[PDB]
Design a protein around this ligand. Structure first.
Ligand code: CLA
Ligand code: CLA
Ligand code: CLA
Ligand code: CLA
Ligand code: CLA
Ligand code: CLA
Ligand code: CLA
Ligand SMILES: CCCCCCCCCCCCCCCC(=O)OC[C@H](COP(=O)(O)OC[C@@H](O)CO)OC(=O)CCCCCCCCCCCCCCC
Ligand SMILES: CC1=C(/C=C/C(C)=C/C=C/C(C)=C/C=C/C=C(C)/C=C/C=C(C)/C=C/C2=C(C)CCCC2(C)C)C(C)(C)CCC1
Ligand SMILES: CC1=C(C/C=C(\C)CCC[C@H](C)CCC[C@H](C)CCCC(C)C)C(=O)c2ccccc2C1=O
Ligand SMILES: CC1=C(C/C=C(\C)CCC[C@H](C)CCC[C@H](C)CCCC(C)C)C(=O)c2ccccc2C1=O
Ligand code: SF4
Ligand code: SF4
Lengths: 80, 134, 166, 73, 74, 740, 43
């Protein structure tokens, strides 16, 4: 399915997890001193690719990037 | 799964044969008061006093519904994934805490220590099965 | 004073009786039970049609289906087809009608030879129809459609051409 | 059509036909193996442009040939 | 041709009075709020409704009476 | 319980808000950081629902906004009447209406406009109008210029009173909400006074002023000899000579001896032979009949005195078996939301404007309209196009209500709630009708277009070959011919000569003629039904699925107007309720563009044309519609290619401007495709590289440039697409008929 | 105040409208008296 990649420029807004409709994302802690918050993509099978996460990311350019790929019943949002 | 179905006469927008054949999801929640709430797909329904249950064709219908229930000040919403063999799993809050808030048990998944700007050029990666975003 | 205003919001009132109902007893399902969908008249008719009738073989189902369609498809080719104002107009209808029957039988075999997905259940017919859920049942249905289809068109040809004597 | 009326409107229309076929009594027997979905965004640009070009080609060819051949001059 | 002339007679006045009597009997039971803010004098004689219902039930009577007088005059 | 509450000095009248643009919203008020702020400043200007949540400020803004709008319409109508006074040939048109063309515009002697001023008769060189105001002012009884001058001044005065009112009712004297919510008082007042008494007064005008003036002018009396309107009131001998019913006076009215007024109140039900136009006496009997009906109809509702209905009671009592709670909750919707009231008022008003166009052509209600073929087409076309736009707006605001103002508590198992539940069945079946009609209605043209090319006319769907006669319409036609003396015993002639009767010839031209329906009309009426159904499919789907869909469950939080939700789920593009409206407008165009061509070709072919004294009619195209309108090539050959000859050859004549705008309209239509096909993703990249050149030369702008938004690019396209589309037919219809 | 009114003319549309009308009026003025010009005459 699709792949959501999260890069070093995260700052811990948490907005990506909120805008997501499918709960593909989760905020995890960082062992480092940067912050106690990093975005993750644990369940990418439910990613549909609506790019709402990329609309809520206030970086110079996207810390969290969604790369489209192979399709499935879930990623296409087909209730039939 | 135990709960009362919200009372509504029915609607063409709802579960199809994909529910029985492939998979169906179910959302459960508890209320203080019986109110009226818009269903995820068309219409209105009267949620009961406690332990409501609703079967939804997709996971998006539940989290979309969960946002509406939060405006009614209900945060004890839970979603399940029901397979045709009856297998049920605790999907959305796999950890009891919500995804927005932090927990120690979680771990990083698909993290790139580099920046997007430092991605490798694709000409460096061809005829190898590798993608630039890895 | 109130001819009808007092009568509303009473179960005894004829307006308040509800004809539409949720599919089965679960409203979460898609369909809705209506007079067109779930009436006894429509249930009897659809459930006892050849595709849905109880206790028939797949071959006998298609023969009933093909004899109907074969006898139906003769009409459009004869009266409205080309050479409709010629002596051999009725003959062209017999050949053209059988042509669709062959293509119709070919389509059945293709949908059959492709492993079919399922035969579905609905409000109008709660039980599954028959053994149309297999590669073997659909194949026998196709062979039956071609026999009845050629027979029905011949019957329509004989009656229409010999209508003056009748 | 394909250049103007993009996908997401059509995908909703397809979902209704899926309901009608899965709920009509006699056509429940026959069903798709491949789930029907609307054409993608990039596909429509392909299908639409091919229509724009095939028409642009043919209708001028008929004009150029018939106008010259009809007059032969 | 058009409808013939009609000369006013006491018969026309009787029909108009009968039509109002129909409207008053019709307006008495049918009306949900006969009473109102303006109170008529000697309410017992007017069945217990005020000036607004007086003009109302007398108006439909005129419509009926008008309709009958020209309806009968074919 | 319908009191008049008015607040005192709600808002000041300072000029400071003019200085600071963006006072609408907190976002726009902050500042113009980018160029999208400019486009957003306009797109939200009349969106009062976004500015303030307080419903009072919404209604006060709207009530004052209508007043400024009426000032515009009054200034417009006054300008038409003013142009009729100074720059016009109306006074010459009255003496010789048939052989003189109507003109009201004069271009100035500059670079070469002056060719547009052409000989239209009456010693006047100007542009030939097609609005029909000359026929209107004649029906009003205006016979000189000064009398026409005074009416223009009153409109400007009336314009100022409207303009003063909005200031008065927004700055000084603002009504509260519940003053607006008294709908029962609103309906009584509008029905009885605006529509009832307004019609009643016009009956007084037609009886006193128009009908005697029209009768004298029609009987050969010169305009100089016709008395003025005031003289009829003072001197009653003049009216008695024309209409002897006035001799009896007002006594027959009260004694119900209404036969005395049969002279000037009639049911002739036909057109005046001398002037193509309905009898003024019928128009006098007309408005008198309707005023009584409207005045009666208004008293239904309660309005503080207990006598009448609560509309809530009528709706709630109209439930039934198939609809659970019935119309329970709707009255709260119409009273709560302005958008829902707009949707109803705009949709049905649009259908009126189409119905008006249909009644007017078959029953020309003004003198000398039928002979003026130019005025009939332009009026029939303009009204249909207006009604088409309004009907589409009714679907838009229906969706805006559903996204913003729809409450699930109120609409609980009501009629609206059930429709949303089975929206799938409504659309899947409507989809079947659209495919069924499109195959049959249009495929039959392809069969005829194919068979004729193969050389098989025997197999066409024609009148001589296989034929599809509209037997039902032929039958309903026949009843209206036989209704006079049958089911309409007091009717002398049929209602319209289009249904049947005999040919009516005003001068050399035919005013109206029976419209025989053949196989060609069978197909076209289904083509119209075909295009209308698809337009409803696009719009109705926009309303029902505006709130939610299987593809997108939460479509309301995104809003009514949003471009997409990502490239996920396949593609979620043009899924909003706005984008459905954007699509329906193209179909509204295709729906109505055939209507005006069906009217233009048939009337030219079957109805209109010069008639000989012996009784032979020579139509303009001569039966071209019967055999050629059953194939697409015939519409391309006999209608577009043939009738457009005057347009392209208009250069060097008074009609040359039509050939230009006919040509320039093709530009804007293609210019639309630049926006519809393309996308913002390309254009921001091009603006990027162009900004580099300005940053180089230090010409960089402070307001950073930004490409147009996605939905805006669709909005601009449909604007050009319809503007360049309609304007083409506008010049094609004008120049073809003004020459013919 | 008067200062608020001057800024309304200072805005883009009113400023653009007055300037282009003054600009357009000059051309319509010149084409009136001097009717038609395609080239500068040659001394
Ligand atoms: C001169 C006229 C007249 C007379 C003699 C009466 C006389 C009477 N009315 Mg009466 N009435 C009148 C005018 C009159 N009313 C008018 C103008 C109205 C309203 C349009 C009514 C409405 C009215 C009602 C509603 C009732 C009467 C009743 C009675 C009684 C008594 C015989 C009452 C009755 O039947 O007996 C008490 C009764 O119920 N009348
Ligand atoms: C005794 C009862 C009576 C009778 C015999 C008539 C008879 C008639 N009415 Mg009439 N009418 C009546 C009561 C009556 N009316 C009442 C009570 C009302 C008020 C609601 C009306 C209101 C009415 C209207 C509004 C019209 C008639 C019309 C007619 C005429 C026939 C129209 C038609 O289609 O056939 C006929 C002369 C029509 C008529 O006369 O047209 C010429 C017409 O338009 N009637
Ligand atoms: C007497 C002078 C006067 C003055 C000083 C004001 C001042 C004000 N009015 Mg006001 N108003 C007036 C007359 C006046 N009004 C009249 C006569 C009406 C009735 C129509 C209104 C109706 C009205 C409403 C409904 C509202 C205001 C509002 C306002 C405030 C903000 C207006 C603003 O910034 O936009 C200035 C805008 C302009 C100068 C553009 C106006 C365009 C005009 C009206 C239409 C032109 C149409 C034109 C022919 C189209 C041609 C198009 C084509 C050729 C290109 C401000 C205090 C608003 C407010 O209080 O905000 C909270 C508000 O909502 N007014
Ligand atoms: C719908 C509104 C409307 C429209 C479109 C027109 C359009 C026109 N008017 Mg006009 N007019 C109108 C309302 C309107 N009028 C009203 C309400 C009045 C009465 C107050 C007048 C009084 C009037 C006069 C007195 C004259 C015109 C003239 C003109 C023409 C030239 C305009 C010009 O030079 O602009 C100039 C624009 C600016 C200076 C800015 C043009 C056809 C002139 C004309 O046709 O002369 C042959 C002319 O002399 N108009
Ligand atoms: C009674 C009529 C009526 C009324 C009161 C409204 C009122 C409204 N509409 Mg609406 N609408 C109508 C008819 C009406 N509409 C019709 C007939 C259609 C179908 C075409 C629409 C389609 C429509 C859409 C699609 C939308 C609205 C929206 C809105 C709201 C905000 C609009 C705004 O900010 O204005 C400012 C609007 C503009 C500045 C656009 C200007 C368009 C120009 C005039 C087009 C050019 C036409 C012109 C004649 C061309 C020739 C001249 C030119 C060459 C110079 C507002 C409540 C918006 C909304 O979401 O509501 C909340 C919205 O998105 N309307
Ligand atoms: C000429 C151009 C054109 C055509 C033909 C269509 C056709 C269609 N559009 Mg459409 N559309 C167009 C332009 C066009 N569009 C444009 C430019 C836009 C942008 C505004 C849209 C926007 C649009 C929307 C928004 C909607 C449609 C809808 C529809 C469908 C209506 C159903 C119908 O008529 O039955 C089908 C009829 C035909 C295809 C007509 C011709 C068929 C002939 C008679 C049969 C062919 C002969 C034979 C079988 C060929 C066999 C060859 C063999 C060798 C293979 C249909 C598929 C609606 C829809 O899908 O609802 C159902 C809908 O909602 N369109
Ligand atoms: C490529 C675009 C283009 C170009 C190069 C021109 C150039 C010209 N046009 Mg043209 N025109 C254009 C677009 C263009 N126009 C458009 C879009 C239209 C309308 C659709 C017209 C309509 C038009 C007409 C109707 C006429 C011209 C005329 C002219 C010529 C004289 C202009 C003049 O008097 O100068 C201005 C005069 C000066 C003295 C210069 C003063 C400079 C400043 C203001 C002084 C300070 C000139 C050769 C005229 C012509 O050819 O006459 C022979 C003429 O009658 N044009
Ligand atoms: C059939 C006539 C409608 C008869 C009709 O609507 O029935 C009306 C019937 C009445 O139910 P109720 O008595 O509850 O309605 C009471 C009302 O007061 C509530 O609105 O309701 C239904 O059966 C719903 C069926 C709607 C769907 C029916 C199919 C409509 C097809 C589309 C329209 C075709 C028009 C063709 C002619 C132009
Ligand atoms: C009223 C109604 C209806 C209608 C119906 C119809 C119209 C029917 C159909 C019809 C049909 C559709 C019929 C058909 C029939 C057919 C037949 C009658 C057949 C025959 C056959 C035969 C007899 C054959 C035989 C054979 C064979 C098989 C082989 C060999 C040869 C032969 C020839 C011997 C419906 C249901 C819709 C709905 C409800 C109501
Ligand atoms: C109509 C339409 C659809 C729906 C169209 C569909 C599902 C296509 C249905 C066509 C069927 C498959 C018949 C077509 C048959 C062709 C004549 C032959 C094609 C076969 C070749 C491979 C040989 C979209 O999905 C779409 C998506 C994005 C933008 C615009 C549109 C769009 O306009
Ligand atoms: C061309 C195009 C653009 C770009 C269009 C732009 C940027 C239009 C710009 C219009 C004006 C000319 C901008 C400048 C306005 C200035 C104020 C004018 C100068 C002032 C003098 C004239 C007085 C899009 O953004 C777009 C988006 C989505 C789909 C299609 C398209 C599309 O086709
Ligand atoms: S930058 Fe993007 S991914 Fe990082 S916390 Fe903010 S919204 Fe989430
Ligand atoms: S594209 Fe959609 S599913 Fe994927 S991370 Fe973004 S919001 Fe979540």
């Amino acid at each position: 399915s699709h792949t959501v990649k999260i890069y070093d420029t995260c700052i811990g807004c948490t907005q990506c997890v909120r805008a997501c409709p499918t709960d593909v994302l989760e905020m995890v802690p960082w062992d480092g001193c940067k912050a106690a918050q990093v975005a993750s993509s644990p369940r990418t099978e439910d990613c549909v690719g609506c790019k709402r996460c990329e609309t809520a990311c206030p970086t110079d350019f996207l810390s969290i990037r969604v790369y489209l790929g192979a399709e499935t019943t879930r990623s296409m949002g087909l209730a039939y | 799964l135990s709960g009362k179905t919200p009372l509504f006469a029915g609607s063409t927008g709802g579960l199809l044969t994909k529910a029985v054949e492939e998979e169906k999801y179910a959302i459960t929640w508890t209320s203080p008061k019986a109110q009226v709430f818009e269903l995820p797909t068309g219409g209105a329904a009267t949620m009961h006093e406690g332990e409501n249950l609703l079967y939804i064709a997709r996971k998006e219908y539940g989290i979309a519904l969960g946002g509406q229930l939060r405006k009614f000040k209900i945060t004890n919403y839970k979603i399940y994934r029901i397979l045709p063999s009856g297998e049920t799993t605790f999907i959305h809050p796999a950890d009891g805490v919500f995804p927005e808030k932090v927990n120690a048990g979680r771990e990083k998944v698909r993290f790139n220590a580099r920046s997007i700007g430092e991605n490798p050029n694709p000409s460096q990666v061809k005829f190898s099965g590798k993608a630039t975003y890895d | 004073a109130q001819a009808v205003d007092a009568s509303k919001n009473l179960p005894s009132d004829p307006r308040n009786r509800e004809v539409v109902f949720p599919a089965g007893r679960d409203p979460q399902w898609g369909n809705l039970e209506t007079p067109v969908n779930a009436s006894p008249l429509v249930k009897w008719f659809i459930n006892n049609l050849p595709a849905y009738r109880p206790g028939l073989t797949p071959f006998r189902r298609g023969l009933e289906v093909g004899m109907a369609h074969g006898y139906f498809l003769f009409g459009p080719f004869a009266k409205l087809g080309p050479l409709r104002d010629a002596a051999n107009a009725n003959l062209a209808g017999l050949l053209g009608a059988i042509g669709l029957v062959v293509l119709f039988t070919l389509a059945l075999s293709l949908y059959a030879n492709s492993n079919p997905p399922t035969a579905l259940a609905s409000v109008t017919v709660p039980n599954p129809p028959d053994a149309f859920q297999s590669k073997e049942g659909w194949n026998n249905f196709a062979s039956a459609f071609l026999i009845g289809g050629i027979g029905g068109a011949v019957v329509a040809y004989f009656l229409t051409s010999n209508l003056a004597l009748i | 059509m394909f250049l103007i009326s993009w996908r997401g409107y059509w995908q909703e229309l397809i979902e209704t036909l899926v309901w009608a076929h899965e709920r009509t009594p006699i056509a429940n027997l026959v069903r798709w193996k491949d789930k029907p979905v609307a054409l993608s965004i990039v596909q429509a640009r392909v299908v639409g442009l091919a229509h724009f070009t095939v028409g642009y080609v043919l209708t001028y060819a008929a004009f150029l040939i018939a106008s010259t051949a009809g007059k032969f001059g | 041709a058009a409808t013939t002339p009609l000369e006013w007679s006491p018969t026309v006045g009787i029909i108009m009075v009968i039509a109002n009597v129909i409207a008053i009997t019709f307006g008495r039971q049918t009306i949900k709020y006969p009473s109102a803010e303006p109170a008529l004098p000697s309410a017992k004689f007017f069945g217990g409704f005020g000036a607004p219902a007086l003009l109302a039930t007398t108006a439909f009577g005129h419509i009926l009476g008008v309709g009958l007088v020209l309806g009968l005059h074919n | 319980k319908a009191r008049v509450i008015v607040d005192k000095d709600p808002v000041p009248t300072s000029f400071e808000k003019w200085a600071q643009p963006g006072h609408f919203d907190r976002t726009l008020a902050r500042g113009p950081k980018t160029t999208t702020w400019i486009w957003n400043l306009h797109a939200l200007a009349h969106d009062f629902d976004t500015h303030t949540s307080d419903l009072e400020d919404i209604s006060r803004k709207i009530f004052a906004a209508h007043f400024g709008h009426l000032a515009v319409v009054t200034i417009w109508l006054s300008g038409m009447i003013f142009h009729g006074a100074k720059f016009s040939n109306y006074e010459a048109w009255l003496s010789d209406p048939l052989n003189v063309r109507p003109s009201a515009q004069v271009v100035w002697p500059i670079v070469g406009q002056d060719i547009l001023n052409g000989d239209v008769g009456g010693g006047f060189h100007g542009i030939q109008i097609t609005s029909g105001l000359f026929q209107v002012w004649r029906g009003w009884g205006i016979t000189n210029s000064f009398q026409l001058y005074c009416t223009a001044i009153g409109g400007l005065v009336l314009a100022g009173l409207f303009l003063f009112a909005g200031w008065f009712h927004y700055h000084k004297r603002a009504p509260k909400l519940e003053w607006f919510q008294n709908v029962e008082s609103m309906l009584n007042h509008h029905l009885q006074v605006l529509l009832g008494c307004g019609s009643l007064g016009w009956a007084g005008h037609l009886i006193h002023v128009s009908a005697p003036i029209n009768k004298l002018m029609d009987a050969g009396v010169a305009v100089k000899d016709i008395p003025l309107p005031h003289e009829f009131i003072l001197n009653k001998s003049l009216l008695i000579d024309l209409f002897p019913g006035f001799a009896a006076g007002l006594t027959p009215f009260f004694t119900l001896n209404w036969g005395q007024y049969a002279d000037f109140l009639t049911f002739k039900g036909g057109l005046n032979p001398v002037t193509g136009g309905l009898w003024m006496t019928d128009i006098a009997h007309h408005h008198l009949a309707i005023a009584v009906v409207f005045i009666i109809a208004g008293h239904q509702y309660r309005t503080n005195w207990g006598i009448g209905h609560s509309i809530k009671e009528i709706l709630e009592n109209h439930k039934g078996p198939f609809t659970g709670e019935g119309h329970k909750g709707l009255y709260e919707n119409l009273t709560t939301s302005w958008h829902a009231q707009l949707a109803t008022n705009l949709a049905f008003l649009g259908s009126l404007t189409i119905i008006i166009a249909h009644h007017m052509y078959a029953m020309p209600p003004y003198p000398y309209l039928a002979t003026d073929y130019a005025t009939q087409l332009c009026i029939f076309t303009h009204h249909i196009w207006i009604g088409g736009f309004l009907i589409v707006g009714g679907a838009a605001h229906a969706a805006i209500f559903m996204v913003r103002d729809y409450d699930p508590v109120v609409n609980q198992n009501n009629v609206l709630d059930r429709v949303i539940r089975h929206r799938d069945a409504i659309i899947s079946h409507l989809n079947w009708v659209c495919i069924f009609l499109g195959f049959h209605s249009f495929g039959l043209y392809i069969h005829n277009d194919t068979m004729r090319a193969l050389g098989r006319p025997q197999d066409m769907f024609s009148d001589t070959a296989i034929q599809l006669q509209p037997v039902f319409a032929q039958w309903v036609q026949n009843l209206h011919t036989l209704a006079p003396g049958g089911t309409a015993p007091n009717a002398l002639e049929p209602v319209s000569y289009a249904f049947g009767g005999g040919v009516l010839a005003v001068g050399g031209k035919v005013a109206m003629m029976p419209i025989a329906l053949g196989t060609a009309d069978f197909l076209i009426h289904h083509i119209h039904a075909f295009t209308i159904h698809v337009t409803v499919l696009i719009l109705l789907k926009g309303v029902l699925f505006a709130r939610s869909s299987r593809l997108i469950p939460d479509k309301a939080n995104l809003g009514f107007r949003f471009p997409c939700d990502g490239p996920g789920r396949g593609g979620t593009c043009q899924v909003s309720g706005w984008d459905h409206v954007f699509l329906g407008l193209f179909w509204m165009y295709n729906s109505l563009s055939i209507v005006i061509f069906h009217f233009s070709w048939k009337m030219q072919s079957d109805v209109w044309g010069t008639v000989d004294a012996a009784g032979n009619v020579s139509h303009i195209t001569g039966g071209n519609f019967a055999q050629s309108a059953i194939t697409i090539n015939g519409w391309l050959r006999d209608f577009l290619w043939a009738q457009a000859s005057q347009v392209i050859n208009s250069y060097g004549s008074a009609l040359s401007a039509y050939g230009l705008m006919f040509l320039g309209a093709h530009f804007v239509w293609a210019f639309s495709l630049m926006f519809l096909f393309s996308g913002r993703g390309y254009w921001q990249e091009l603006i990027e590289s162009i900004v580099w050149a300005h940053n180089k030369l230090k010409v960089a702008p402070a307001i950073q440039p930004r490409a147009l938004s996605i939905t805006q690019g669709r909005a601009v396209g449909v604007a050009h697409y319809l503007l360049g589309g309609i304007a083409t037919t506008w010049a094609f219809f004008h120049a073809h008929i003004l020459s013919v | 105040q008067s200062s608020y009114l001057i800024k309304f003319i200072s805005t883009a549309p009113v400023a653009a409208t007055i300037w282009l009308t003054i600009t357009a009026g000059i051309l319509i003025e010149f084409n009136r008296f001097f009717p038609d010009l395609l080239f500068h005459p040659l001394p």
